[PDB]
Every structure is written in structure tokens, then in C-alpha cells.
Amino acid sequence: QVQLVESGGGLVKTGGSLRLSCAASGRTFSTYSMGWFRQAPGKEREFVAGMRWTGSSTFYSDSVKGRFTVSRNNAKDTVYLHMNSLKPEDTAVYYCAITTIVRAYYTEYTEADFGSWGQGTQVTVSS
Amino acid sequence: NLCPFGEVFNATRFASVYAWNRKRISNCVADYSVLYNSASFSTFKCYGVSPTKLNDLCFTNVYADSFVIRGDEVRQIAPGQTGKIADYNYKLPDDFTGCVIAWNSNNLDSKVGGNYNYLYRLFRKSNLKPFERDISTEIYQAGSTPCNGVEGFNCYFPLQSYGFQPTNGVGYQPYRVVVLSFELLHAPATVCGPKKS
Amino acid sequence: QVQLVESGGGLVQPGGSLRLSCAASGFTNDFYSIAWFRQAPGKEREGVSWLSVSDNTPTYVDSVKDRFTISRHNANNTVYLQMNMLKPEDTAIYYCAAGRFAGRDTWPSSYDYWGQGTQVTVSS
Ligand SMILES: *[C@@H]1O[C@H](CO)[C@@H](O)[C@H](O)[C@H]1NC(C)=O
Ligand SMILES: [Cl-]
């Protein structure tokens, strides 16, 4: 396990933007692919978006594609979820995590593949 | 002075097939017939040569290539084969001279809940050349539309974990593979079979 | 072009003997190997004996070691499996298979050339 330091929750208006951040010292993000997940009350933790350890590939669930972007800083120690065109349906606790499991089809990732979970941050989209 | 085949055959961990390892062997006596007659190996196939002939030959270098694949891919480690291992991971030349050795490694390389360390390349724009080793990790563009750094329709990550579990059927259990190839240079021929010694 | 002609099967009592034959035609040279695969009721094909022809090296699985002998007669280009002290366990369809290599493999998919099976039944 490694410590992932996650930040950036909050309240935002429908159509607004937020950035979440996930930081880890040294070569963590250049070693293990990362994913963002979210969990609404009494629902399962679902995949949102991620990036390969390479930093040159990102991927998105169908519910957020074209609205959310993932990026990583030049130091390769901080990954961002840029949330745009937020809808009330995006209200949830968001988590970053990493995986040792390589799936050629990112569509097959589930929460069970991930570990070293960041602290959940609440995103609330008011209408 | 016996060739240190132990270092190759008995290594605690093996390479993933996409990132296969090569060990150079020289300055030693190699008993290919003792290897051939060993019950430890379930696959032992020579091309362009036989173990008796190798026992009577000297080479400058022997190369031992080693990696893990699943059982149902062992047949792809031969000249003229197709499939994802032969096409995209580890390719022998049509005119291959050497030996393919394999054994079931379920007791070493599988784990309860899956051993995810071993990978193979699922996709590549062209077939590997013989003895080419491709460790690249760029998105595979399966169609005409560029991926521009995003996986999706016809845009796949090129590597896949096996995830070996002990309960897998034998076609999906891990096999350790060693390929022996032979090199003759204008230099002392210091790797000899026991007869040419 | 390449063809394997199998024969020699039948019904025998437990303790009896049987001589299976694999006749290999369309090979240029001696650089091939033969395998015998048996398929017991409800099991997959399983290798029991191998012969690397150029080297004349036999291999056997442990369960047939001392009872089974594999050999080749040069004149008629035919590989024989002499099966002695047969048990009920040895009941199966026996296939010979060939590959253009010197050696042996447990994987049927590694052999590109196959005879039609011969039935071996061992009971009282
Ligand atoms: C690997 O180790 C075993 C002893 O555990 C030995 O019998 C075998 O010869 C070794 N393999 C080689 C190629 O030295
Ligand atoms: Cl990955």
C-alpha cells in the first residue's frame, strides 16, 4: 500500500466545474495505473475515469466521456479529475486508487481491481 | 565445466513473454541429451538439429530465451505458427535451428486470487520480426481514427495480464518456456556437447 | 501429401498384449517425431509414448513405462507401440501423430499430422 492524498470536493451549480486532485510521492503514478471512482448513497462504487502509468493514455466511463478529463502534472506525482458540465446525477463521494492489474480493455476494470484508496471527497451538484 | 543451465531452468521468477529474457551461455560443456531425457520437461522440440547432433557440436554462444505463457499458447512457440504470442510477443524464424522446452509452472506462477505480474501483448500494428522484443506501451489504434491519447472504440491498451489462478484449466495454467538458439562466429567455439570435448 | 496409417487395435483380456502400427508416407527425410495419444471415455487426448525418428529416442509416461515399448522398422517406415501387461485403464482410442521436429510434446495442438484412431478395449 501507498498513501494517496486526495483533495477538492464541494458544492457546485448544475453546469459548473470542479477539479479533484490525487497526489502520491515519487514514482507511484509512473508505476501503477490510476482510477477515479464514485459512490452515491446506497449504490456500488462505480468507475469514472483513469490514466495508465505511462501518462499518455486516459479513459472514461460512458456516463462522463466528453464532460470529464483526467490529466497528470509534469512531475508525474499528481493526477487531476477535471469535472465539467456537472449534472445532479454526478453527486457522489469520489475516490482515487491505483491497480497492479493490466486490462487491455479499461471497460473491464472494477473497484475490486484497485487499492491504496484516497479519502472520499463529496461532490454535490445542486440544480 | 558444465553450462549453468540451472540459472535459466530453475530461476525463481521468469519474464513476461512481451519482455522475454535472453541469457548468453559460453565457455562450458552442454549435455543436451540429459536435458532432452529429463521428465521435468513436457515439451522438448528441436528444429534443424536434434539433441544427439547438438551433443557432437561446438558453438561460440548459446542463447536461452525464457518467459511464461498459458498452456494453450505453447504450440505457438515453433516456426511458422500464428496467434497472439507468435505474431505480437515472441517469434521464431521459418528457418529456426534450436530447441523449444516447456513445463507446467502452476505451482510457481499461479496464486489464490490471481497472479497479475505476467503480461502479454494482445495488439500490434504489424507482426514481430524473428527474435524482436517490443516493450512499448502506446495505445493501439485498431482503425483509421487516431486515439489522441484516449482509449475507447478501436483504441485499446496493448498489454493484458494473464491473472493465473491455481484452479484454471490446463490450457489457461502458466507454462515456463526456454528456447535455445546457437551462434557461430569467427571466435573460439567454447560451448560444446560432451562428444565434441 | 503427409499421411499416417494406423492399425493393430482390438479386444484383449487384462494381462494381454497388443501391437499398434503407424505407417508414415509423405515425408522427404527422417526429420520428424511420432507421438501416441490415447483418449479414454470422457477424457481429452493424452500422450503416452514419443519417438524422435532421426535420434531414435523413445519417451514414455510413468504409467506405461515398463509395459509399453515404442520402436521403428526402417524398411516399411512404420513406428510400433508394443503394449504388454495391459490393464482396464489402458482402454481408449489410440492416435499416432507426427510433427516436423526432433522431440516430444504433451500438447495435441503441437502435432499437425494425425492417423484415424484404433480402438483398444481391455476387459474380462
Ligand atoms: C533444477 O533443480 C533440480 C534440483 O531441484 C535439478 O534436478 C535440475 O537438474 C536443475 N535443472 C538444471 C537444468 O540444472
Ligand atoms: Cl494498467
Residue numbers in the entry:
A (entry chain FFF): 1 to 127
B (entry chain EEE): 334 to 530
C (entry chain AAA): 1 to 124
According to the publication:
The RBD of SARS-CoV-2 is the immuno-dominant region of the virus spike protein and the target for neutralising antibodies generated either by vaccination or infection. We report four nanobodies (C5, H3, C1, F2) engineered as homotrimers with pmolar affinity for the receptor binding domain (RBD) of the SARS-CoV-2 spike protein. Crystal structures show C5 and H3 overlap the ACE2 epitope, whilst C1 and F2 bind to a different epitope.
To further define the epitopes recognised by the nanobodies, crystal structures of the C5-RBD (Victoria), H3-C1-RBD (Victoria) and F2-RBD (Victoria) co-complexes were determined to high resolution (1.5, 1.9 and 2.3 Å, respectively), however, the C1-RBD binary complex failed to give high quality crystals. The key binding interaction between C5 and H3 nanobodies and RBD is a combined salt bridge π-cation interaction involving an arginine from the nanobody (R31 in C5, R52 in H3) with E484 and F490 of RBD. In addition, in H3 the key R52 E484 salt bridge makes additional hydrophobic interactions with W53 and F59 of H3, these contacts are absent in H11-H4. In H3, in addition to the R52 salt bridge, residues in CDR2 (R52 - F59) make either (or both) hydrogen bonds and van der Waals contacts with RBD (residues T470-I472, G482-E484 and F490). From CDR3, I101 to Y106 make either (or both) hydrogen bonds and van der Waals contacts with RBD (Y449, L455, F456, E484, Y489, F490, L492-S494). Compared to the H11-H4 interaction, H3 has pivoted around V102 resulting in a shift of 2 Å at R52. It is this pivot that brings FR2 of H3 into contact with RBD. C1 relies mainly on CDR3 (R100-W107, S109-S110 and D112) with some contact with CDR2 (W50, S52, S54, D55 and T57–T59) and one interaction with CDR1 (F31).
